[PDB]
Design a protein around this ligand. Structure first.
Ligand SMILES: NCCNC(=O)C1=CN(c2ncnc3nc[nH]c23)CCS1
Lengths: 20, 338
């Protein structure tokens, strides 16, 4: 499931901004 | 056209503060530090108590040398100039600002219910009426901000706080900018970037309406429409623009999202001739009373559980660090206007 894929991903915590 | 009349007077109030910004309105010694509520690349935010009134506030601390190193001087001056000038029920209030030898300080109203991010991840996803309640508040806030020629550029659940009555308070204006033309800075958060930002095109306020589409999707689904383990892979997904919706999304929600998550600027809702009213009058918002939302008369679907006056259970725990103030002034010329 997409939910399962998200929860196993590295981006479920607070996400940092980019300013590149 | 009483929205039109509200906004005309809103602009006159903003411009007076924009042209003559408040400066140096408190001092670090007037506050007792209680607890770190948040900390990352963006800086550090602490719960503090104002000694003379006993009021509680959230104090953002920025290291001047780190701002210079990240080349965020102008963005930081943007943030304080803009935040001290705006006034809207769903924007966090800037109560004081000041600087010392080492740091910049922005003292904001303390919002005890925690970040929407926290509740969204724990609960999993919001029901459509619950997500619609928050979305309506963002729609009105962007209408207010954009009429002042402000672009927000960092919408995400991490920047939305929940107050004691369950309403949203937008925080972190680090990327906000007053601009009438196009602008070009690559900034924001990967999952929320509109395609034109990624493609280095020059862009305008339409990127905020794209970000609203990502937020509504993330609230209603529990995950964002474009995710992957690394940002480069996220950008590839965004620029193709193929969105799949969960089977439980209503037909109206999918239609609103196809018009917000629209790569074609000539078709993206918010950006057309009819402006924000294409969104306000969409079928998904048909049960929404926009005036009652603004007046905060709608009963909120979720009320934070709050025990003490400076109770912090709704925020995570962080390693407390010192607030070191060097003996010598750092970056004096860079931040003279702060
Ligand atoms: N790019 C992420 C930005 N994150 C923050 O700005 C933080 C804000 N926090 C606050 N908490 C309570 N009241 C507040 N008033 C203003 N900010 C407040 C703590 C969590 S992190």
């Amino acid at each position: 499931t997409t939910y399962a894929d998200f929860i196993a991903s590295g981006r479920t915590g607070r996400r940092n901004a980019i300013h590149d | 056209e009483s929205v039109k009349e509200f906004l005309a007077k809103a602009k006159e109030d903003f411009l007076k503060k924009w042209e003559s910004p408040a400066q140096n309105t408190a001092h670090l010694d007037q506050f007792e530090r209680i607890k770190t509520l948040g900390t990352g690349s963006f800086g550090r935010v602490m719960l503090v108590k104002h000694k003379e009134t006993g009021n509680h506030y959230a104090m953002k601390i920025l290291d001047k040398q780190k701002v210079v190193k990240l080349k965020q001087i102008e963005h930081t001056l943007n943030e304080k100039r803009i935040l001290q000038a705006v006034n809207f029920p769903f924007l966090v209030k800037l109560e004081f600002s000041f600087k010392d030898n080492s740091n910049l300080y922005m003292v904001m109203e303390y919002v005890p219910g925690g970040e929407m991010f926290s509740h969204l991840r724990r609960i999993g996803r919001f029901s459509e009426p619950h997500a619609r309640f928050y979305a309506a508040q963002i729609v009105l806030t962007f209408e207010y901000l954009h009429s002042l020629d402000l672009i927000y550029r960092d919408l995400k659940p991490e920047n939305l706080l929940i107050d004691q009555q369950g309403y949203i308070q937008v925080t972190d204006f680090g990327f906000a900018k007053r601009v009438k033309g196009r602008t070009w800075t690559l900034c924001g958060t990967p999952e929320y970037l509109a395609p034109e930002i990624i493609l280095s095109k020059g862009y305008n306020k339409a990127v905020d309406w794209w970000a609203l589409g990502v937020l509504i999707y993330e609230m209603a689904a529990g995950y964002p429409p474009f995710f992957a383990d690394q940002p480069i892979q996220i950008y590839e997904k965004i620029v193709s623009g193929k969105v799949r919706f969960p089977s439980h999304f209503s037909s109206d929600l999918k239609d609103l999202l196809r018009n917000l998550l629209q790569v074609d600027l000539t078709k993206r809702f918010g950006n057309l001739k009819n402006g924000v009213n294409d969104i306000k009058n969409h079928k998904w918002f048909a049960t929404t009373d926009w005036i009652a939302i603004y007046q905060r008369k709608v009963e909120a679907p979720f009320i934070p559980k709050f025990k003490g006056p400076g109770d912090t259970s709704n925020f995570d725990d962080y390693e407390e660090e010192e607030i070191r103030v060097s003996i010598n002034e750092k970056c004096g010329k860079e931040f003279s206007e702060f």
